Structures are given as C-alpha cells and as structure tokens.
Design a protein around this ligand. Structure first.
Ligand SMILES: Nc1ncnc2c1ncn2[C@@H]1O[C@H](COP(=O)(O)OP(=O)(O)OP(=O)(O)O)[C@@H](O)[C@H]1O
Ligand SMILES: Nc1ncnc2c1ncn2[C@@H]1O[C@H](COP(=O)(O)OP(=O)(O)O)[C@@H](O)[C@H]1O
Ligand SMILES: Nc1ncnc2c1ncn2[C@@H]1O[C@H](COP(=O)(O)OP(=O)(O)O)[C@@H](O)[C@H]1O
Ligand SMILES: [Mg+2]
Ligand SMILES: [Mg+2]
Lengths: 145, 194, 900, 238, 48
C-alpha cells in the first residue's frame, strides 16, 4: 500500500494501512514523509508500541531534510540514495535496474543499444559532479530520463 | 509539440517550464486545439488543495478534456505530494486504456478518485506550466516530477513570430518591418533606464 | 479634451494643453484612455500624490459624458483584507464556496441582473501589489480573460470590464504581472504644486466650510492668500527649504499641503467666529489682511516643520524671515514658532498663555492635571486646529513625552467628540477596529448604502490608536491595518466582508500615536497613508520644562508639611538631576526595558505625595528618605546587572548630598531603605528584622490557610514582597516579574495577594487549551472583578501563552481594562444584566448599556491586577517589547533574576 | 414655477404606472420590465435632487421630500423583489420537475412549498392591483420580500448534494458553479436563459440555434457568430 | 402549589410559557439553534 503524505486523508489512509498490515503482514510505504515532522514523531511513537506480523514492512521514502525528527532516524534503518560514485557504478546500477528479459529480446542488437544508452547516461550524470565545467547547471538527469 | 506528444503517447503529462512570457500556456492550448481538445486553463494557487484538485481531475476525466494547470508550483508541497497519487492513478487508467485486449464492448475503465470510481475518457490529459526561477515557489516532489515530461521553453523566436504575424495582417513589407521591430525592442530593453 | 475640460472645471481641477499648467496631467489622462482602449488590464504607477486617482476619475466622468455610457468604478484595497476575503474561501468540511470581494464584484457584473453589462465597469485595485494576490489574476490579465477558482468555476471577463491597479511602486511585483498589464507612469512632476494650490483656492472660494457670510470670508481670505500661492512664491520656497531639513518622518508634499490647508480653513472659521461674536463691527479688510498673512506664515511654520526638532523649526523660521515680506515679530533671538497669531491681527507670544499656576494639593501628579507649558500650549492649539477639521492626525515622539496627555487636554476643549482608546501591537489586524466599530458604532441602511455611525447622536467618535507603527509589516512591505485605515480615511469607508458591501463611515475620526520609526520594533508608515495624516512631533520636556512642571507639583505636595516648604526648590532639582543621569546612563541599547520618561518622575511625585499624605510632621531627613526610597523603587527595580544597581545607589547618594547639604547622612539614607504599612496604618519606614518576624508569622498562617509550601526567608524575599505589595495597592496596578524559574515569583505573588485580600486566579492550561478557552477564562475573571467588585490577582506565566492572540487580548486588557470584542452575543446580555445588578447594589443610577459598560470597565480597572512572570531571556524580552507593548508601558517591571 | 410642473408630471406617471405582468406556465403572473421601472425611479430621484438644488425648492420642499421617500420605498422594494422572483423561478422548476428530490430532501421540499404558497399568494395580490403605488402600499410587504429572499437563499445552500449528483449525470456540469447549475436545471424548460451558460461548458460554443418554438436544437454558434448546423437536429421534446 | 402548577403545564403541554425569559430565553434560543443544525435542521426564527 503506497501512500503519499501531505493531506489529512493521507494521514487517515496511512493509519488504516498500518493498522491492517501489522496484522496481515503486508507492506506499507509512505512517500515524502519529511513534509510532516510532527506526524512523523507520533508515527514513531505508535511504531514503538507494536508487535506486528513477521512479514510486515514499513518503508518511509523521504528527502534528506533537517526537519526530520532524530527519534525516527534512530528507530529505523537509514538507506541513502544518491548519484552512483562513478561511471562503473552508474552502469552497474543501470544494468541492475533494467530486467534481463527486456534487454534480451528477439533483436540481438537491442542489448548493445541498451549498453550504449547506459554508457551515455553514466557519462552525463557523472559530469554533473563538476558543476561549471560538466554542464552550465545541475540538471536533474535521472532514472526517469 | 514533439515533447508533449511524446509525453502523451507515454500516457505521461507535459511540463513546459521557463521564465514568463515564453509562450508555454499558449503552446499547450495550441497543441490541444490542433487535436481538437477541450483545453481548460487553471490558474493554480495555494488553495488548490487535494480535494479541489481531485474534483477538477474527476471533471476532466469524465468530460475528456485537457487540464493545463498554470503556476503549478504555487501549490503547497504537501498538496503537490498528495495530488501525485491522483495523477498516478489517472495515468495508470489511461495506460490500461491503451492495451489491445480491452475493447469498447467491455466494462468502462474507471480510476479511484476521491474515494469513488470515476470513468476516464481517453482524450483527457494533464499539463503543468511553471516558472522554476521564482523565489518562494514550492519544489515538486520527485515522485510527482517523474510523472511529467519536462521541456525548457526559455527563448521564443520573436523574429519569426513578428514576421509571420505582420505577413498575415496584410503588411507588404512584413519581413523588413519585423527585422526592424524586434531589434528595436531588444534595444529598448538594453538601452533605456532600468 | 472638451469633455475633460468641463469635468475638471466642475471638479476644481486644473486643465491645460501642452506646456500650460496641467498639460502633462491631461496628456497622462489621454494616454490612460489610449491604454484602456488596448488593454483590459492597466497599472497606473507613480509616486504618491501624482494625480493617478483624479486622472482616472476624470477620465471615467468624461467618457460617460462623451459616449453616453454610464461608468461605474469598484475600488478595492486588495491588501487591506485577507486574500481569502478578496478571492473567496472553499470550506474544507462541506466544500461550499463563499465568494470574496473581487469574485463577488466580478460575478455580479457577469450576471448583469441590473444591467451591469451595459455600463463601463472599472475594477480599480488601489493598494500594494505582491505576488501573492495579484498572480491569481494572471489568467484575468492574460488573453484567457478568466478567473479560475479552486472550486472548478471559471468566470469570463466581460468586454466592458477593465481591471486597473493604482500603485505607487512595483518593487515586489514579479515580471509575470508587469508583462500582462498596460503601464501608465505618472511622474511626481506631472502634478505640479501650482495645480494643488489652484484646487485649494477654487474649493475655498466655491465650497463653504460651514456646510453667504462664510463664503464671503473664504473669498476674501483666498484673495489675500493668492499672492503667496504662486510659482516661486512663499509657500513653494518654504516647501523647497523644508525638504532640506530632517523630520521625524519622511516628508511628502501633500502631507504638508493638507496640514496647511486645514490650518487655513481653521483660520477662516476663526474669522467667522470673531464676526459672530462682534455683530456691530465685522472684521475689516485691513485687519483681515494682517490676520490672514500672519496666520498663513504661522501655519506654514507649523505644517512644514511641526514634525521636526526645535532646531529645525528655528531653521525654518529663520529662512522664512529671510525670504518673506510679511511683517514679523521684532524679537532679537526668539524664533517665530513661539509666537501665535491673535484674532486682532497681531503676533502674540505663547508665553503669555502659560500661567504660573498652583495645583491643588490633592490633585498632584494626577493623570488629568496638566501643568501648562510653552510646548504644551502650542501642541494643544495645533491639535485643536487639526481635530476641529476632523482631519486624522499622528502624534510622534519618544514614549512618555506627553502625546496622550496633550491629545486628551486638547480634546477637553472639544466637548462633541468622545474618544475610544486602541492599543496596536505587532499582531494587530483590522479586526480590532472592526470589534471597536461593533461595540461603539452601528450599521444602518440608507438609500445611498450602508452607513456606520456612532450610537450617540451628534457626537464624533475619535479612535485613538496608540502604536500605529507596531503592526507586523509583510515581507512585501505592507501593514494590513495601516492599509485599512488609509482606505477608511481616503475613501471614507471600507468593505464589510460578511456580504461584501461598501460601508461608509460617518462621524468617525482617526488619531494615532507612535514612537519614531527608527525605534526598535517600529516600522515607517506608508507614504500614501502619511499624505492624509499630519504628524506632530512631541519631544521630551527639557530640563527647564521638567523643572517647571515638577517644581509646581512638589510645591503643591510639600504644602502639606509647611516646615518642608523651603525644600521645594532643591527637591525637584535633585529629582530632575537624578532622572537626567539615569536617562543618560541606562539606554535602550543595553536592555529593551531601559526607558526613562517623565512618567517616571510623575510616579516619583505621586509616590512621595502618597507617603507624605497621612503624616502630620517630618524632618528633612524623612523627606530625603522617602525620596531615596521612591528613586530606588522606580530606577533600580528594573535593572539587570549588579553594577547598574551599585551605580544607582552611589549616585542617589551623590545627588542627595549635593542638593541637600547640612543634613545627617546616616539618619536619612541608611542603606536598607524599606517602607511598609503592614505594621502600622501609614506608609512609614520599617526595620528589617521586625519585618522579617512579621512576615514569618504571616507565612506560618499562610501555610495553614492557603498554600502549604514552606519558604526560606531572606532579605531579597522581604524586599520583593514589599515591591509586590506596593503594586497590589495601586489602581490598574499590573506586575511583570522577570526571573529564573523556581525563584518563587508565583509563590510570593500569591502570598502577597493573600495579605492584600486579592483572590488569586490562574488559567489551568493543558494540551488542548485553545483561544476559546482563554476567552472564557478572561470572561470569568472580568465578570468576577467587574460585576461582583472582587479584587483579583490574575497570575500568568509566559508558558501559558500558547498563541499571539493571547498576547493581543492581554495587551488590550492591560492597557484599557477592557476587551472590546470579548463579551458579545448572549455573553454581552448576561454581562449587562450582572452589571446592572452590581451597579444598583453599589447605589448607582445606571441603566443604559453604554454607562453600564463604562462602570464595568472602571470596576475592572480598579479591581484587576495582572502579574506576568517570564524567564530572563534577551531575544524573548526584545520580542515581547513589540509583541505586547503594554507589558512594558502599563506593567511595573521587577527583575527578580537568579538568587545571588 | 416649473417645480410644480415637475411634481404634477411625476405624480401623473406614478398614478398611471402599473406593473408588467405575464402568465408563467399557467401558475402565476410574473413581472417583466425591471429595467424600465428602475430607470424611471432613478430619473425621478435625480430630478427630485435637481429640484432640491433649485432656489424655489423651499415652498415645494415638503411635497418633494414625500416623493423621494416614496421613490426610495419603491427602489428598496423592487431591488429585493427581482432577486426573489428569479430565485423562485429556477427553484420551482427543480422541486417540481424532479421526482427523486422529494424523497431525498423532504425538509427542503416542505420549506419550498411553504415559500411557494406565500409567494403565489402575494403575487395574486399583486395581479389584482398591478399599480406600483398600490403594491407599495401593501402593509408589511417589504419585510415579506426580505424574509422570502432570505429563506430562498437558505434553501439554495441545501441543494449541494443534489447538484453534485446532477454534475455526475452530465460531466461538463463540473465546470459550472452551484447557482448557475441551479439556474440551468430550473430553466431547462425555458432554454432562452441557458444561452449565457454554454461558454462555461464548451470550448467554443457560446449559444445554441433553436427553431421558432424552441423545441429542436438546429445547431450551435460561437461568440463570433459562426454557426454549425447539425445534420440530425436534436429534439428537446423527445 | 407553584411547583404543581409548573409541573401541570409541563406535563400537559411539554413546555412552560413563562419559564424562559430575558437572558434565559436568548441562551435557550442559541442552544436550540445549535441543536437544530446539529440534527440537520436549518432554523433561526425564534418561533420555529
Ligand atoms: N489636475 C489637477 N488639478 C488640481 N488638483 C489636482 C489635480 N490632480 C490632482 N489634484 C489634487 O492633488 C492631490 C493629488 O491626489 P490624487 O488622488 O490625484 O493622487 P494619487 O497619485 O492618486 O495618490 P495616491 O497614490 O496617494 O492615492 C489631490 O488633493 C487632488 O485633489
Ligand atoms: N506639561 C506637563 N504637565 C503635567 N504633566 C506632564 C507634562 N508633560 C509631561 N507630563 C507627564 O508625562 C507623562 C506623559 O505620559 P503620556 O502622555 O502617556 O505619554 P505618551 O502619550 O507618549 O505615552 C504624563 O504622566 C504626565 O504626567
Ligand atoms: N523562598 C523560598 N524558599 C523555599 N522554597 C522556595 C522559595 N521560593 C520558591 N521555592 C520553591 O519553589 C516552588 C514554587 O516555585 P514557583 O514560585 O512556582 O516558581 P516560579 O517563580 O518559576 O513561578 C515551591 O515548591 C518552593 O519549594
Ligand atoms: Mg502561463
Ligand atoms: Mg489615489
């Protein structure tokens, strides 16, 4: 159950989804939780006093933002998503993201094209690390492109 | 036109961005009129909350009209994040409208809007027009930015516009007149007092 | 052009073609018309008083005459109301749309129930432009010509409607708004001073000031003043020089000109009054000419330099004497500003109207008693001139200079005006004015529209707003309440947002008071607001003036004890000296609350008098001891650091020994100076150990009766309880105890209240405490202390303040003893019932609601004492110095601090 | 002494002026000519004021004063009235042309029936004596119209859910406000008032083309006058 | 006997005509209003 945070209906939906998933063991994801720090504090307090199902998982997608409470940061496990460190890591992540079947279709040239695309991506994104020289500004060349 | 048609075929939205007066709203309206679409222009502000946008989306989906939401980044960031859900649901319904197995003899395609099932016409689209250079404007969440294909509309071709408008209005010397009037405006911008 | 000429002729405006006077303004009107023909959205941009309003009004009238199409203008101040009140609100619960002001106007035009589409409709946004409200018009000004509301509704702009913005600057509007509008730039040179003079003279000759002898007097006065109202004349040169001087507020041409015109109207009224009082001999041409010339130069001096220091007034007087040909007083060094103009047509010194009065012994240091002074009489005359014309005015000066005192003294001479006090804070919105209107005024429907007028017939309601430059200024440089007041003053009304109806003010007048805009927390007022309000600068009385006032007070005081009369001259001097030193030593740069004013010396005199009242005899030693005790209580209680208190002690020593020689130092000023009436009937000095024993016994009783919390006594506790007892015995005596938590401020306050018989009231705050709960608690305490004559100590901590609304309510309650919008509906009816029972219980014949409410306010003032406690923070104290100004003007500040 | 002539002409106009009544679907006799009556009142008030500026006004002051009062009492009476009538016309067409609203909103239906009874009674009284002066002299009529308008406005705010359902019926109604949608539903019978509401529902349609009896939609027209004629005209009776 | 008179009126009619008056009647009208909009009835006339 994926829920975007920011509206009162969103808070009610998140509460209901968590209440049903702690029992059923299903997964709940809440996006952009950094837009409600007080609700984040009360969410951490609610999460502390629970004994959910063994398969229950709550994901909190957020942006690195100092308004995020530190009690939530300590309660949960943090994974930082950022540009890959280099060209090789960028290409590895690109090849991991694309399914194997999608690259390996009936046209045998497709794979090479994909590789070229990956390389091109891995180039331009890395040039973002050199702000004035790589480009004129920090463009958001990302996974959507 | 190329970028927005690419976004439409991918069942995404279109996001022309740039400074004011570059012809973003009019370009979206012109593309909509080129396809014979009912394009509704909305001047968004901080009061365009989740429920108001949901109702507007319901109307657009049922009618099958284009929604050009100008000044989209004037919404609150929490409201933009909340509206991303409705945009994603509408785009999913539009995407499942394009599948070959489903035909118009089956049940109508609906999406989940405002806790109700709303029929989605295939002619509808969502376009957002914004100027990301204004200070104090909201920053779109990435999950909402990924639902739109963006295009930088920063420098309109004033010379060609002036030449064609003067030619179509009956001016026999339209080319010379445009070549005199556009540099004149540039000189007024760069020569008069600020 | 012919239509414009006719309209300007009928509107007392100057018309010209090309290089003639008014030619540039007429060209601007023509350009405005051309821009209207091309754009549906316009912006008339130009400095304040550049002719924009008159330009578009004359254009509207001329177009109606020329084309036969009736023109209707809807003038909206977009920043005098909230954006929700301007565009509309979508209710989050029921999702029901309520129109705003602009939305309602546009929808009414669109519907055209009464033929609104056959008229020329001009929606003029007369106010500041910021990217918050004007961007909602982006589609309206764009080729779309639509107003898109959040409820999905789309309102098309009719082809006969023009959206106009009349602004003085565009430093906050974004390019998206500037690019969408047709600009017409009115320079300040477009409106020459010659046209302003011509308009003034034409209105004087044509419009009677009464509502003909009055018209004849006006015509002769205009004939006399015509030579001076010319290009490069007396008034223009005086304005040019006065622009070089420095004023307490930024000088604008029309502020000075409007002040001068009001003075000249008052001069004509004075001539009419003289003719009425002398039916046999009306004023002749020679006398009228002399009087008018002298009054004109006097009015120029008091209008172009009435908001500056005495040095700048003297400089303007010297320059005028240098340039003018009007006969002037022949005094060698006396500046002209000290000379008034007698009705006989001769210069008369102001000092002749400052008698050396002798105040009654029982009325010393009284709030009403005003010791006449040169500055006092000059300012009273100026305020009488401005108020009599119903012109809104501003009193600028340092706190405690005498702005309120001067205003009320001037208002005593005007019996047909009743004054209502308003205390602006940083959180002040037009809602305070609206609550005052709901209380003291009434809305009535007339065939011309809705009129808001005072309930009392035949009287003018004077709204005295005391901190007009405190309210928060937006990030786009606008104070909403100042815009509201400007709308009420310029357009003579406002918009009721309940039904979006234009309400016209009747018999309502505006007086404001403020500190100089360079003071911390004070913002400079808008120029478009300042052009309507003359500003008079009320500075601190000088050492000579202070000596005069408080020597008179000390003489009237020491007449109680004849043997002390010979010490009237030194005592006052010592007072003044010490006060000056304090005001020179502790400035506001160190601490925000280090403000010393003649209020301190007035409290000094009043305290000494209250100490001397019951005593039959005293040596000079006792008088010096009382003087030192009052100095300690007034100048050392607020001090923060120890070195400041040491300085205060040693300098009290030096001042008392210097101004009172041949006295025994130890008998009169032994260091532990304590006074109390707990062990006797009089406020007499008390020994520290006997006081300690008495307080120990009273605490032993207190533990058993009220609060069982044992306390450890020490000298600071005795001093603090004495300080608290001093204030609990004063009318409208509120405390502000600043010290570390756990220092015993609340406990000592409750203990002293228990001694004084005060009932301790504390608001019981919890997690879900809201503004409504605080309003209910305020109603409860006000009903107890005002309807039941119950003395109450309302004790409140800074922790109890959960919102700025709490501080606004408390500011109003402390300053006025009443909250205008607290009791309303059924609460007001119940309050009136209880007030009637309480009044008949106290043997008073009171039945009207106005007099019942006045009695209730007096009871609250006499019975309620508010103790406010907070921690000694720096940023917090600086913030509270502006968020709740009364907390530092009506509350005695006691710095408990930490335990030493 | 032209002031006396002005008084006599105003008195003659106002003792020969009568309301303009027309049958409304065989239910009552509504009023047209609101603009004519309002213009008459405005010009008479303006002439009275211009007389008040005259130097012979004193001897004709009293009478003139009386007339302005009467004129004011006329203007205050018919500013509310028109609104009342309009709010009735498009509400009577909703509570009578719809069957589910009776079952869904019984309190509103009963209240509107009461208001309709009072309005029809007052309108019959008007039809008996259509003289404007006679209608003004009805005791307690201005207060009656004010109460009628207040109650009709209160009923209007109670139709939100019904309007939302109607919007669900025809999707383009989502771009139409509550009051405009109420007007459309009420005057569905008289399509002549619908023409101003098409620009809110269509991209370029500003009006519909109708035959003489307003029963068949022959085509559509834009704001510039451009017309599109349907190949198969739409019948409103069917 | 006044107790029995008040109770007789209350039992027979359901209300006492003179019980609420002055500020009591105004407060009663306010509470009756709030209760009416709480029950889904839009009433503001004192008689209804
Ligand atoms: N053509 C004119 N001839 C004579 N007097 C004029 C003329 N135009 C304006 N005035 C007068 O000069 C003053 C200018 O006021 P006005 O309302 O025109 O200024 P403004 O530019 O609109 O100011 P603001 O922005 O402060 O409202 C007024 O007292 C007005 O009566
Ligand atoms: N000429 C005077 N005669 C008597 N008292 C004066 C005079 N000038 C100043 N004062 C004293 O100064 C104080 C001024 O306080 P106030 O008028 O409230 O100042 P503000 O209006 O700036 O707050 C008064 O308490 C008054 O007693
Ligand atoms: N002079 C004193 N002697 C002993 N205890 C004291 C004294 N003053 C304060 N206290 C202690 O402080 C507590 C109450 O503090 P309080 O007066 O509420 O603090 P604050 O000044 O922050 O309001 C009591 O429990 C008491 O024990
Ligand atoms: Mg745009
Ligand atoms: Mg103006």
């Amino acid at each position: 159950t994926s829920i975007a945070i920011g509206s009162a209906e969103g808070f009610n939906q998140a509460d209901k989804a968590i209440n049903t998933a702690v029992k059923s063991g299903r997964w709940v994801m809440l996006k952009n939780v950094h837009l409600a720090p007080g609700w984040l504090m009360q969410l951490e307090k609610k999460l502390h006093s629970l004994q959910p199902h063994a398969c229950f998982r709550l994901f909190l997608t957020m942006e690195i933002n100092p308004k995020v409470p530190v009690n939530l940061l300590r309660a949960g496990r943090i994974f930082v998503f950022e540009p890959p460190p280099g060209v090789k890591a960028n290409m590895l992540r690109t090849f991991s993201s694309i399914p194997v079947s999608r690259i390996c279709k009936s046209p045998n040239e497709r794979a090479r094209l994909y590789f070229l695309l990956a390389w091109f991506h891995a180039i331009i994104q890395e040039r973002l690390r050199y702000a004035p020289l790589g480009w004129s500004k920090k463009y958001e060349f990302g996974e959507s492109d | 036109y190329l970028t927005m048609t690419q976004a439409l075929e991918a069942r995404l939205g279109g996001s022309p961005f740039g400074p004011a007066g570059t012809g973003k709203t009019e370009s979206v309206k012109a593309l909509g009129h080129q396809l014979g679409r009912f394009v509704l222009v909305f001047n968004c502000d901080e009061t365009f909350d989740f429920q108001a946008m949901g109702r507007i989306f319901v109307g657009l989906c049922q009618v099958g009209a284009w929604g050009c939401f100008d000044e989209f980044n004037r919404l609150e960031e929490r409201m933009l994040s909340a509206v991303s859900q409705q945009v994603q649901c509408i785009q999913e319904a539009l995407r499942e409208h394009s599948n070959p197995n489903y035909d118009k003899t089956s049940a109508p395609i609906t999406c989940e809007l405002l806790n109700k099932q709303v029929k989605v016409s295939p002619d509808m689209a969502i376009f957002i027009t914004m100027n990301p250079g204004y200070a104090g404007r909201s920053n779109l969440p990435d999950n909402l930015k990924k639902l739109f294909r963006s295009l930088a509309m920063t420098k309109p071709d004033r010379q060609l516009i002036a030449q064609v408008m003067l030619y179509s209005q009956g001016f026999r010397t339209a080319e010379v007149l445009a070549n005199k009037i556009v540099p004149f405006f540039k000189l007024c911008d760069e020569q008069l007092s600020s | 052009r012919e239509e414009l000429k006719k309209v300007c002729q009928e509107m007392y405006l100057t018309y010209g073609d090309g290089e003639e006077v008014g030619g540039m303004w007429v060209e601007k009107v023509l350009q405005l018309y051309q821009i209207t023909q091309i754009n549906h959205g316009l912006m008339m941009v130009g400095p304040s008083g550049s002719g924009k309003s008159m330009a578009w009004r004359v254009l509207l009238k001329a177009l109606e005459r020329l084309e036969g199409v009736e023109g209707v203008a809807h003038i909206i101040d977009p920043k005098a109301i909230s954006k929700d009140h301007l565009y509309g609100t979508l209710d989050p619960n029921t999702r029901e749309w309520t129109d705003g002001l602009f939305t309602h106007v546009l929808r009414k035009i669109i519907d055209s129930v009464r033929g609104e589409l056959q008229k020329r409709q001009w929606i003029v946004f007369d106010g500041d432009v910021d990217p918050e409200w004007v961007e909602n018009l982006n589609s309206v000004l764009d080729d779309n010509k639509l107003l898109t509301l959040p409820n999905g509704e789309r309102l098309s702009l009719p082809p006969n409607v023009r959206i106009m913005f009349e602004v003085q600057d565009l430093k906050y509007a974004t390019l998206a708004t500037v690019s969408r509008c047709g600009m017409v730039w009115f320079s300040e040179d477009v409106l020459s001073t010659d046209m302003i003079f011509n308009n003034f003279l034409a209105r004087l000759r044509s419009i009677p000031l009464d509502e003909s002898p009055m018209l004849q007097i006006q015509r002769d006065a205009a004939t006399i003043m015509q030579p001076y109202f010319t290009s490069n004349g007396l008034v223009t040169k005086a304005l040019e020089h006065a622009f070089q001087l420095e004023h307490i507020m930024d000088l604008t041409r029309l502020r000075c000109l409007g002040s001068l015109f009001s003075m000249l109207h008052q001069a004509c009224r004075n001539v009419a009054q003289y003719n009425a009082n002398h039916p046999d001999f009306p004023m002749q041409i020679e006398q009228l000419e002399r009087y008018i010339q002298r009054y004109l130069v006097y009015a120029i001096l008091w209008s172009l330099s009435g908001d500056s220091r005495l040095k700048m007034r003297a400089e303007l007087g010297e320059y005028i004497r240098r340039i003018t040909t009007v006969p002037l007083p022949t005094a060698p060094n006396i500046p002209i500003i000290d000379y008034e103009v007698s009705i006989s047509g001769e210069w008369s010194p102001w000092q002749a109207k400052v008698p050396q009065i002798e105040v009654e012994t029982h009325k010393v240091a009284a709030p009403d008693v005003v010791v006449p002074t040169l500055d006092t009489v000059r300012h009273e005359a100026l305020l009488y001139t401005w108020l009599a014309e119903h012109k809104p005015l501003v009193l600028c000066g340092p706190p405690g200079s005498g702005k309120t005192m001067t205003l009320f003294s001037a208002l005593r001479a005007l019996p047909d005006m009743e004054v209502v006090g308003l205390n602006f804070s940083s959180a002040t919105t037009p809602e305070l004015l609206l609550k005052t209107f709901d209380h003291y005024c009434e809305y009535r429907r007339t065939p011309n529209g809705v009129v808001l007028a005072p309930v009392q017939l035949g009287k003018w309601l004077v709204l005295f707003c005391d901190e007009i430059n405190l309210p928060d200024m937006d990030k786009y440089g606008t104070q909403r309440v100042i815009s509201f007041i400007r709308q009420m003053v310029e357009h003579g009304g406002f918009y009721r947002t309940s039904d979006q109806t234009w309400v016209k003010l009747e018999r309502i007048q505006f007086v404001g008071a403020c500190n100089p805009p360079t003071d911390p927390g004070r913002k400079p007022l808008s120029h478009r607001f300042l052009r309507h309000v003359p500003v008079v600068y009320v500075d601190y009385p000088g050492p000579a003036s202070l000596t005069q006032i408080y020597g008179t007070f000390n003489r009237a005081m020491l007449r109680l004890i004849p043997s002390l009369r010979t010490y009237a001259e030194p005592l006052t001097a010592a007072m003044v000296e010490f006060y000056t030193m304090s005001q020179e030593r502790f400035t506001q740069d160190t601490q925000p609350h280090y403000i010393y004013s003649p209020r301190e010396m007035t409290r000094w005199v009043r305290g000494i008098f209250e100490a001397l009242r019951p005593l039959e005899t005293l040596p000079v030693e006792g008088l010096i001891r009382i003087w030192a005790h009052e100095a300690l209580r007034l100048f050392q209680d607020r001090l923060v650091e120890d070195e400041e208190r040491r300085w205060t002690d040693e300098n009290i020593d030096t001042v008392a020994l210097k101004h009172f020689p041949n006295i025994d130092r130890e008998k009169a000023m032994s260091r532990p100076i304590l006074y109390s009436n707990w062990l006797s009937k009089d406020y007499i000095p008390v020994d520290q150990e006997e006081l300690r024993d008495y307080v120990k016994a009273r605490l032993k009783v207190f533990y058993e009766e009220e609060l069982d919390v044992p306390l450890v006594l020490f000298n600071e506790v005795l001093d603090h309880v004495l300080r608290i007892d001093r204030i609990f015995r004063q009318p409208q005596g509120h405390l502000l105890l600043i010290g570390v938590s756990g220092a015993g401020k609340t406990t000592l306050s409750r203990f002293v209240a228990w001694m004084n018989g005060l009932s301790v009231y504390q608001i019981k705050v919890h997690r879900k405490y809201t503004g409504e709960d605080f309003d209910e608690d305020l109603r409860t305490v006000l009903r107890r202390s005002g309807c039941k004559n119950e003395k109450i100590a309302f004790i409140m901590d800074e922790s109890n303040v959960l919102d700025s609304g709490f501080l606004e309510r408390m500011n109003t309650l402390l300053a006025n003893g009443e909250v205008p919008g607290l009791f309303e509906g059924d609460e007001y009816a119940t309050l009136m019932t209880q007030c009637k029972e309480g009044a008949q219980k106290e043997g008073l014949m009171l039945d009207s609601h106005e007099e019942l409410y006045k009695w209730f306010t007096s009871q609250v003032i006499r019975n309620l004492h508010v103790v406010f406690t907070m921690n000694p923070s720096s940023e917090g104290l600086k913030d509270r110095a502006a968020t709740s100004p009364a907390l530092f003007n009506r509350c005695v500040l006691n710095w408990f601090g930490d335990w030493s | 002494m032209a002031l006396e002539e002005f008084l006599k002409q105003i008195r003659e106009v106002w003792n020969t002026y009568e309301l303009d009544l027309v049958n409304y679907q065989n239910k009552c006799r509504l009023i047209r000519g609101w603009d004519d009556l309002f213009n008459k009142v405005k010009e008479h008030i303006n002439s009275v004021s211009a007389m008040k500026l005259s130097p012979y006004y004193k001897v004709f002051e009293e009478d003139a004063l009386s007339w302005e009062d009467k004129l004011n009492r006329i203007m205050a009476l018919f500013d509310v009235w028109i609104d009342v009538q309009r709010r009735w016309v498009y509400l009577e067409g909703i509570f009578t042309g719809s069957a589910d609203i009776k079952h869904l909103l019984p309190v509103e239906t009963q209240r509107f029936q009461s208001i309709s009874t009072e309005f029809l009674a007052l309108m019959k009284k008007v039809s008996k004596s259509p003289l404007v002066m006679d209608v003004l002299n009805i005791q307690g009529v201005q207060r009656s119209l004010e109460r009628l308008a207040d109650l009709l406005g209160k009923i209007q705010k109670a139709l939100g859910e019904y309007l939302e359902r109607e919007r669900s019926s025809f999707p383009r109604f989502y771009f139409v406000g509550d009051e405009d949608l109420l007007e459309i539903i009420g005057n569905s019978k008289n399509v002549a008032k619908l023409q101003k509401h098409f620009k809110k529902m269509f991209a370029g349609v500003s009006s519909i083309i109708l035959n003489e009896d307003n029963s068949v939609v022959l085509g559509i027209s834009s704001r510039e006058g451009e017309e599109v004629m349907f190949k198969t005209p739409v019948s409103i009776t069917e």
